[PDB]
Amino acid sequence: PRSWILPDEFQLFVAQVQMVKDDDPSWKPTFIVKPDGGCQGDGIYLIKDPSDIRLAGTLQSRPAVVQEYICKPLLIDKLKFDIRLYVLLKSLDPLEIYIAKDGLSRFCTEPYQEPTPKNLHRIFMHLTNYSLNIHSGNFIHSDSASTGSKRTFSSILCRLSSKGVDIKKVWSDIISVVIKTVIALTPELKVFYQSDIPTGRPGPTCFQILGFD
Amino acid sequence: PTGFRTFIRSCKLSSSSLSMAAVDILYIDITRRWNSMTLDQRDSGMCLQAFVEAFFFLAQRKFKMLPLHEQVASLIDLCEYHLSLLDE
Amino acid sequence: MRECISIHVGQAGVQIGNACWELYCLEHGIQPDGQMPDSFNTFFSETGAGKHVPRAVFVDLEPTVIDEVRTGTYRQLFHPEQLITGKEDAANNYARGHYTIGKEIIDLVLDRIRKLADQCTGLQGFLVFHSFGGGTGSGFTSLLMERLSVDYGKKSKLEFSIYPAPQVSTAVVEPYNSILTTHTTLEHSDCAFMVDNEAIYDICRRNLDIERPTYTNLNRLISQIVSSITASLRFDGALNVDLTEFQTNLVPYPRIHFPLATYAPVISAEKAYHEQLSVAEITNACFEPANQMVKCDPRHGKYMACCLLYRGDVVPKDVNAAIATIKTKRSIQFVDWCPTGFKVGINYQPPTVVPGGDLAKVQRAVCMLSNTTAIAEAWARLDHKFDLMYAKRAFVHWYVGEGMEEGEFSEAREDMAALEKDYEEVGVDS
Amino acid sequence: MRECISIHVGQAGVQIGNACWELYCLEHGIQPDGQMPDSFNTFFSETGAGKHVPRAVFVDLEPTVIDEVRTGTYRQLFHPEQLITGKEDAANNYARGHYTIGKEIIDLVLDRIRKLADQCTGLQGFLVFHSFGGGTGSGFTSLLMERLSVDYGKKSKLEFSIYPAPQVSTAVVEPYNSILTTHTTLEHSDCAFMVDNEAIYDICRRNLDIERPTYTNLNRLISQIVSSITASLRFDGALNVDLTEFQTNLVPYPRIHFPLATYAPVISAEKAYHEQLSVAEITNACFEPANQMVKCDPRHGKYMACCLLYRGDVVPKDVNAAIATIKTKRSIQFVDWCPTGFKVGINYQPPTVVPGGDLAKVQRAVCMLSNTTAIAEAWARLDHKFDLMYAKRAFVHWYVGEGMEEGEFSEAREDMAALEKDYEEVGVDS
Amino acid sequence: MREIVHIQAGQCGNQIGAKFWEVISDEHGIDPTGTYHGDSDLQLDRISVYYNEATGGKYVPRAILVDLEPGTMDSVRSGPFGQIFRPDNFVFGQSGAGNNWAKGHYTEGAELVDSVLDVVRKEAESCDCLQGFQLTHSLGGGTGSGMGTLLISKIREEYPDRIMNTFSVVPSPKVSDTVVEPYNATLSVHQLVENTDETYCIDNEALYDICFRTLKLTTPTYGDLNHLVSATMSGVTTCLRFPGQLNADLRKLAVNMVPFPRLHFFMPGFAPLTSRGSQQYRALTVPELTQQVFDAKNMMAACDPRHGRYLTVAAVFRGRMSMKEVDEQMLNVQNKNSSYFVEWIPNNVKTAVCDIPPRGLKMAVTFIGNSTAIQELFKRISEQFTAMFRRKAFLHWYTGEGMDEMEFTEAESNMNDLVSEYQQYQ
Numbered sequence A: 001p002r003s004w005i006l007p008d009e010f011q012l013f014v015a016q017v018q019m020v021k022d023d024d025p026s027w028k029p030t031f032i033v034k035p036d037g038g039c040q041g042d043g044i045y046l047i048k049d050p051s052d053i054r055l056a057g058t059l060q061s062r063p064a065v066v067q068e069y070i071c072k073p074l075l076i077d078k079l080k081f082d083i084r085l086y087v088l089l090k091s092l093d094p095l096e097i098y099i100a101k102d103g104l105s106r107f108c109t110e111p112y113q114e115p116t117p118k119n120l121h122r123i124f125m126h127l128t129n130y131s132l133n134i135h136s137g138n139f140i141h142s143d144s145a146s147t148g149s150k151r152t153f154s155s156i157l158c159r160l161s162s163k164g165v166d167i168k169k170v171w172s173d174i175i176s177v178v179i180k181t182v183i184a185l186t187p188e189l190k191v192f193y194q195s196d197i198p199t200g201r202p203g204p205t206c207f208q209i210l211g212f213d
Numbered sequence B: 001p002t003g004f005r006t007f008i009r010s011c012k013l014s015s016s017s018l019s020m021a022a023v024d025i026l027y028i029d030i031t032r033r034w035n036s037m038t039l040d041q042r043d044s045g046m047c048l049q050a051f052v053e054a055f056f057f058l059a060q061r062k063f064k065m066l067p068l069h070e071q072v073a074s075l076i077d078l079c080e081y082h083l084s085l086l087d088e
Numbered sequence C, D: 001m002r003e004c005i006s007i008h009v010g011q012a013g014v015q016i017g018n019a020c021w022e023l024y025c026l027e028h029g030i031q032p033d034g035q036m037p038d039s040f041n042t043f044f045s046e047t048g049a050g051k052h053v054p055r056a057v058f059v060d061l062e063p064t065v066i067d068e069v070r071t072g073t074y075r076q077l078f079h080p081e082q083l084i085t086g087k088e089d090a091a092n093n094y095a096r097g098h099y100t101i102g103k104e105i106i107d108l109v110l111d112r113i114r115k116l117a118d119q120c121t122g123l124q125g126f127l128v129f130h131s132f133g134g135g136t137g138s139g140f141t142s143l144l145m146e147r148l149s150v151d152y153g154k155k156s157k158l159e160f161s162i163y164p165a166p167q168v169s170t171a172v173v174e175p176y177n178s179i180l181t182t183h184t185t186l187e188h189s190d191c192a193f194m195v196d197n198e199a200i201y202d203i204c205r206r207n208l209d210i211e212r213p214t215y216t217n218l219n220r221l222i223s224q225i226v227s228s229i230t231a232s233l234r235f236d237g238a239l240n241v242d243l244t245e246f247q248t249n250l251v252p253y254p255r256i257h258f259p260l261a262t263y264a265p266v267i268s269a270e271k272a273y274h275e276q277l278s279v280a281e282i283t284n285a286c287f288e289p290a291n292q293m294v295k296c297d298p299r300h301g302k303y304m305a306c307c308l309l310y311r312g313d314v315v316p317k318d319v320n321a322a323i324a325t326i327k328t329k330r331s332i333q334f335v336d337w338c339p340t341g342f343k344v345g346i347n348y349q350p351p352t353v354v355p356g357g358d359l360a361k362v363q364r365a366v367c368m369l370s371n372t373t374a375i376a377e378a379w380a381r382l383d384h385k386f387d388l389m390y391a392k393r394a395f396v397h398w399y400v401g402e403g404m405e406e407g408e409f410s411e412a413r414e415d416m417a418a419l420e421k422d423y424e425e426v427g428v429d430s
Numbered sequence E: 001m002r003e004i005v006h007i008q009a010g011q012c013g014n015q016i017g018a019k020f021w022e023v024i025s026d027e028h029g030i031d032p033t034g035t036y037h038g039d040s041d042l043q044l045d046r047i048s049v050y051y052n053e054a055t056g057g058k059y060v061p062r063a064i065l066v067d068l069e070p071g072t073m074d075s076v077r078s079g080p081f082g083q084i085f086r087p088d089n090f091v092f093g094q095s096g097a098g099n100n101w102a103k104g105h106y107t108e109g110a111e112l113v114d115s116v117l118d119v120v121r122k123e124a125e126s127c128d129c130l131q132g133f134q135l136t137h138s139l140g141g142g143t144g145s146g147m148g149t150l151l152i153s154k155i156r157e158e159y160p161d162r163i164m165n166t167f168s169v170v171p172s173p174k175v176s177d178t179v180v181e182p183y184n185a186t187l188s189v190h191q192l193v194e195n196t197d198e199t200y201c202i203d204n205e206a207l208y209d210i211c212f213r214t215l216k217l218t219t220p221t222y223g224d225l226n227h228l229v230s231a232t233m234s235g236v237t238t239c240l241r242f243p244g245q246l247n248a249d250l251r252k253l254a255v256n257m258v259p260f261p262r263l264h265f266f267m268p269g270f271a272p273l274t275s276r277g278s279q280q281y282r283a284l285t286v287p288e289l290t291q292q293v294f295d296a297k298n299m300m301a302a303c304d305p306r307h308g309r310y311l312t313v314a315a316v317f318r319g320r321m322s323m324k325e326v327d328e329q330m331l332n333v334q335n336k337n338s339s340y341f342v343e344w345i346p347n348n349v350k351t352a353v354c355d356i357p358p359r360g361l362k363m364a365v366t367f368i369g370n371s372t373a374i375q376e377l378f379k380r381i382s383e384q385f386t387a388m389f390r391r392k393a394f395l396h397w398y399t400g401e402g403m404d405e406m407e408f409t410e411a412e413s414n415m416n417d418l419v420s421e422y423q424q425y426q
């Protein structure tokens, strides 16, 4: 989804929102603000207008990202869930990418509803972070791979196929977006590899395990 | 800046329309913009994204009235041809 | 209830303001410390202790020109916070004073200007003193003007500026800055008053008979003209020209607001005992090609509006006689659409003489303001210099480094060309 | 018959009290020996032989700060029983000031307070000066206020506190004490004015030009504010405001009693001879979001209520004109449910300038007690720091080891969050 | 009021304490004979913090001096300011316990610890309000490292509510004059971690570095090294004995230095140490003191702070400066070197100000720094210890002096746990 970098691109974000609103008065977007250095969902909040950005304080010097919020995800048991997939990058030259057949599906602890001004503050129904949902009273710890707030991605895929959904196409497009992210992100890694491990000098080989959300 | 000028002189992108002064002005403007963009204001030199912007501008200058995918790619092909001539 | 605020910006503005305020203090009897040993209300604000503080703010993006004011003779006169100074000089760069260094000092100047305006009930306009061909005087002046319209909209913005000479220059980057200041002096000003140093040098050499003059005499002449402009707001006389009547009688069309200033009874002490400086003589001396303070031939163009500000022992009948005889010679030709092109003001106060000056004591003086189409000749040479410099991109990297694009260069050149076209076309007859 | 009793706790409290009582002695005309060479029957009591004993108790947990007063300039001023000191300090520990050492010295302070309050006929209320993250100044103040409310209910208790600064801090355990002490401030004090050291440093640098200030200048500024508050009780004049009157007018709801203090004519005695301090000038300077004594900006808040206290040559006509002028401005905005958002007060006594100070002998001065919703920013900042430690459970073992349970921290956090939401909800529009 | 009882142990402890007592007596204005000859009314207000008033304007320190060799007692007694001490505070043995920690902790120390504790109780009970004790010793010998552990273990249970400091000298790898010395250190750190409120690591090689580099001293001696330790000792407790804008007692320093109970090892420093021919070329300001106070060159411990990150910083300034300048300087450090600071402690620096400066000087600071880099010292000793323990070396002495094999393993486990827990918060 389209993104803006604060505080550098705040004016561009405001101008774009204003122009689209003028073009479409019925347009009621929802944006999500996430800190660059923030992890585990800390500092991430939801806004409906560019003016809703908290621009008064000492915490605004940190760069942030404003992103178009996906207001309509798939819901399983009326709970919006995200998928953590483990991807192996074997080498940059030649490029080698491997994708695990199973992942971890993390579910929200509250029923999902479309973003409204009355439920923006409800982080449990809008954030799928495990560290944030674990403190909720509705979090369920289950040893089964198909129940609880944390499940296996293969189980979710097979439940989806039980409704007649082509899981092969789903897996194909997951593979496509994963490979697309890796190729989009590779060139800076080749630059960093050259900077840190110059050609002609002894050095170890490198690989990585990445968690795609 | 020496790297940019060597690149320009190697892939022969310079011509009557684009002289050395214009190349230097473009380099200075791009470097200043990308240094100011980052949180740290030193950024002594040019990162990769600024080089991507410069390559986009150069590809826009050449091969006019062409799609963007055809652009950049055409300039890459020309630069590779000139490099192959250079090493050969 | 007729207060005016002056904004001396840049080195040239500061050292013209020194002479301006010396002359003002002498005229109104104010000592260099602020105590008199009404008329003084336009330029001075009175406090409880009887101390008169000047109604002006000094701004420069460097200390070296202001500390002389703060440690000189007139050090107890100005408010300590009205002398605003920066830390790093603009280094003859428009972008330096408009985008990078001048952006850190604009807030203090705006706050002090708002503080000054809070003390005025009959505020009339602003008297911006600056100079083209300089980093601060071209960039910070633009920033200040732009924002002084966003804030005070209907107020007047009178501009006194120094223009580059035909062949006598100081910096190799003068055409760039002077072209870039065209936007601000065009669509953020009401009357742009221009003077170049070469013409005042010639005037000093011929009239006052000074072989090697310097900036002080030039600034004193500028102060005399500025005092003549506002001499009606403070003193009393027969015909009084207000600030708004001046520009409603001098500016024909909105974009044509670039008058020309002249001061006739410019004479040394020795050569004044022999010449009877009657009203006709000085009135004719105003209409002399070798007497204008911008190097341009007034016979190579039209005459649109004329304002004659008389001070001293001037009876209106003699003014009518001088105007009548002026409209007889064919060497001074006007525009057919202005059958009446003469505005007259008469005030009683004679001009004053500062100690250690180069101007003789006289009992009548005339300041002449002319809206002539001979300024395009001045702009054309500078435009040619700019094109020659810009054909091979020269010094442009300095401007681009501080945050300016080449679109600014192109647009400024186009704007100047359009203004020149407008001036050339307004001279046609129909 | 208009008596107030002063209490000063901790090093900050005692030093502020020194400044304040020197100011009162200079004002009413009392030598440091308590004997003059009426208006004093609110901070002083007269014995048989002309002595004037102040109505204040100095309490501290460590000997040095009080011992400085015991052997100093004002040695023969306080009844030595009124000077109270312990044996060991709280060591920046709220638990020590509340549960371990404060309870060991709570009897003497109450006995002396009773002895002082039995010597008065009508008691307006107590005054308490302290800190907010200091240990003794938090814990012992909490204990003292908790017992004072029980023993002297339905009686005013106004407190002046030094809230922790957003950036500079003199301690590492500051947020813990600050968060734990905002329960008696919320539920045991009838009013509370908080000042920030950083704001006073900025004010001293910008206004008084004091490059390197010490704590004495800050304390003198607080002394000026406190004298401004309790001026309609001692001296007479125009419209007079007592403690109950401005408490009613400035506290809309019982949970909102956190105003901000401002003193407009802060002049370095060298800018005084260059500007006039009219009623409009000082009234505008009070509302300027730079001359504020805490690090909050009203521009990101709404002005819930306003109290103005004028001293010197002030007439109601100028006050009304200035209030109207403030009303017209749209940059500063009030909430909607107070059409009349001001309570004004005029006194005749000019402010007193102490020797070796930083102020100037002005003719009129104004003190602003402004209730806005911007304070929610400041607490928030402090709030953040607090949890940034409590997540790692840092430095908690000290507080736990001195009779304080683990639940008090979370209780105070929840209380402070509730107060923040309460202050935010009143800013909504109808 | 708020008096401290001083204890010296070993040769290193006795010499450092003698220099310290000369320093404090000069500061408070005390004759070597024991009289007061000084020009100030503030030198005698809190004199009841180190001294006791005997008959006829005589002042006698606390100064419990202990040793198992009766040579250091004679060295201290016949020596500058050596009759200033009470005659019966000298508790001396008959043999210096060799270089054996077992001897001074189990056999020779046992027959003298009771004798010491009698005089310790006798002095303490003559105090209005005992703030605490402080011990100066070295962790490389038998008498020092054994007595300063046995005595501290029995002083802590007797007065659990008081304050206990220790200016210990941690053994250095390069400057080594003892063979069995690592053993002693490994057997002491684990008792200096649960029995003392504070502990200052004073490595000798850092003192030599300061003398060679900062002071341009060709030939330093032990007196020059002890001068710095005495300066830091005085700067730690100045706010208990002279007035200030922001006082900082020992307990106030403790409460905002140790985030957790066992993180009480610090790095000392003294701000204005310059030279003798560079003085004229310097200006005595707050910013320059803060610059020579936070450098990995003015630190009295041999571990680079750049290798770790500070958890907390103290700064007991002494002089008539301004508070705004101090606060501004502290905000610059933290903003400039952000990486060298724990993120979960905002404003890690705790400040203080005392008016009276040390004689001659018009401004000084004492920097106390809790840093994770201190773990280096421990991980530098353990390795050596292991190098000598896998092949049992010099262990017959300790084994025959009553100890058993398991104590060494327990001590190594405790020290390893301390290193790991200090690394946890990095």
Ligand SMILES: CC(=O)O[C@H]1C(=O)[C@@]2(C)[C@H]([C@H](OC(=O)c3ccccc3)[C@]3(O)C[C@H](OC(=O)[C@H](O)[C@@H](NC(=O)c4ccccc4)c4ccccc4)C(C)=C1C3(C)C)[C@]1(OC(C)=O)CO[C@@H]1C[C@@H]2O
Pocket: E022, E023, E024, E026, E027, E215, E224, E225, E227, E228, E230, E231, E234, E235, E270, E272, E273, E274, E275, E276, E279, E358, E359, E360, E361
């Ligand atoms: C040329 C000159 O001006 O000499 C000064 C002096 O200022 C210098 C040389 C002194 C001098 O110190 C040293 O030479 C020195 C040598 C080795 C190790 C440590 C110090 C001085 O000895 C130290 C002495 O300082 C004091 O008097 C302090 O009060 C100090 N006094 C003692 O330690 C002391 C105690 C008992 C008997 C004699 C001295 C002190 C410091 C902290 C707390 C209490 C007291 C002074 C002014 C000097 C000399 C004499 C050269 C310095 O002293 C200190 C530690 O502040 C070393 O760097 C500082 C500043 C100067 O460079």
Ligand SMILES: Nc1nc2c(ncn2[C@@H]2O[C@H](COP(=O)(O)CP(=O)(O)OP(=O)(O)O)[C@@H](O)[C@H]2O)c(=O)[nH]1
Pocket: C009, C010, C011, C012, C013, C015, C016, C062, C089, C090, C091, C092, C093, C131, C132, C133, C134, C135, C136, C137, C138, C162, C169, C170, C197, C215, C218, C219
């Ligand atoms: N007639 C006068 N011309 C002046 C005076 N001072 C400067 N100048 C002219 O101005 C030009 C130089 O520009 P300035 O140095 O005054 C401009 P400023 O100081 O504002 O720019 P920076 O160099 O960026 O500081 C040059 O033509 C000078 O002859 C003056 O007092 N009178």
Ligand SMILES: Nc1nc2c(ncn2[C@@H]2O[C@H](COP(=O)(O)CP(=O)(O)OP(=O)(O)O)[C@@H](O)[C@H]2O)c(=O)[nH]1
Pocket: D009, D010, D011, D012, D013, D015, D016, D061, D062, D089, D090, D091, D092, D093, D130, D131, D132, D133, D134, D135, D136, D137, D138, D162, D163, D164, D170, D171, D197, D215, D218, D219, E245, E246, E252
């Ligand atoms: N504006 C002032 N703030 C002060 C002053 N003295 C201290 N303080 C502030 O107080 C805070 C430090 O805590 P205090 O000095 O109040 C400690 P207190 O004596 O109350 O308790 P103990 O810890 O038992 O000594 C910190 O915010 C200082 O800036 C002063 O004179 N003026």
Ligand SMILES: Nc1nc2c(ncn2[C@@H]2O[C@H](COP(=O)(O)CP(=O)(O)OP(=O)(O)O)[C@@H](O)[C@H]2O)c(=O)[nH]1
Pocket: E009, E010, E011, E012, E013, E015, E016, E068, E069, E096, E097, E098, E099, E100, E104, E138, E140, E141, E142, E143, E144, E145, E169, E176, E177, E178, E204, E222, E225, E226
């Ligand atoms: N700074 C000082 N370090 C010292 C001094 N004396 C010794 N040392 C250092 O400490 C170590 C030896 O300390 P000591 O001889 O005082 C140990 P102690 O006498 O307590 O042990 P025993 O051998 O059991 O008697 C060794 O590293 C020495 O270089 C001294 O006076 N000052």
Ligand SMILES: [Mg+2]
Pocket: C010, C011, C062, C089, C136
């Ligand atoms: Mg200049």
Ligand SMILES: [Mg+2]
Pocket: D010, D011, D062, D089, E247
């Ligand atoms: Mg205290």
Ligand SMILES: [Mg+2]
Pocket: E010, E011, E069, E096, E141, E143
């Ligand atoms: Mg020994």
